[PDB]
């Protein structure tokens, strides 16, 4: 597994991107209308933004909730289920069990010991 | 300018070469550990493989992204800059402006109208 994205949850996409542009982050043109935006970092890791609306479409429990998440990519979809089960029978908090997400990925969410959101995912065939 | 290589981006070098060997492609011994592998075709054109890791060391935007590229060789390094500028002021997508690459070439990347990656290169003196 590899860390693929760090994500922040934003109330207003345009206001958040305006700030990170001031710190030199290279952010796609016209991403102010995006529900989800990504900027590319050295090595290929991305910084991502998701609006509150976006997050609540699959994690309705969110209340201002994590304001960030770490997303790990896995080599295949069964590996997500497998790691999710590995972490939960180890005693960690399973927040949302694995599902086929509308954006094309096997996806699952656990919480680390400090309440942080960790996403587990792989692309759908 | 001459087409020098066709390249595919692979998740696993050994798995990809195992397949093309079954189709008679003559692939160097021990290339399974290579970050970059080439096989020679009639006329001198090569088929190349690059791991995802390799690609991301200079094109961090890659996400499973082009799964192939066409590479054109130029007679000198200034010609790469010149063709890159020619293509971009014509309206085509410049993806990575010319740079001196660690593997010994003046290198640039544009995208064709269908989003495909086209590499422009010449050997460094």
């Amino acid at each position: 597994a590899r860390i693929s994205l760090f994500a922040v949850v934003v109330e207003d996409m345009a206001k958040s991107l305006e700030f990170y542009r001031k710190l030199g982050v290279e952010i796609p043109a016209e991403a102010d209308s995006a529900p989800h935006t990504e900027a590319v970092l050295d090595g290929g890791i991305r910084l991502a933004w998701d609006t509150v609306e976006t997050v609540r479409s699959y994690d309705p429990e969110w209340q201002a909730g994590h304001r960030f998440a770490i997303a790990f990519e896995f080599p295949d979809t069964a590996s997500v289920d497998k790691k999710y089960a590995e972490l939960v029978d180890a005693g960690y908090e399973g927040h949302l069990k694995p599902w086929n997400a509308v954006w094309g990925q096997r996806y699952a969410i656990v919480k680390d010991p400090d309440g942080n959101v960790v996403d587990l995912f792989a692309p759908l065939p």
Side-chain angles (χ1 to χ4, degrees), chain A residues 6-17:
Chain A
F6 294 93
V8 299
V9 179
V10 303
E11 304 273 337
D12 176 320
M13 185 66 67
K15 275 185 39 65
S16 183
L17 305 179

Side-chain angles (χ1 to χ4, degrees), chain A residues 106-117:
Chain A
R106 187 73 169 167
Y107 217 86
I109 304 181
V110 302
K111 293 207 210 250
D112 82 357
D114 285 284
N116 310 316
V117 163

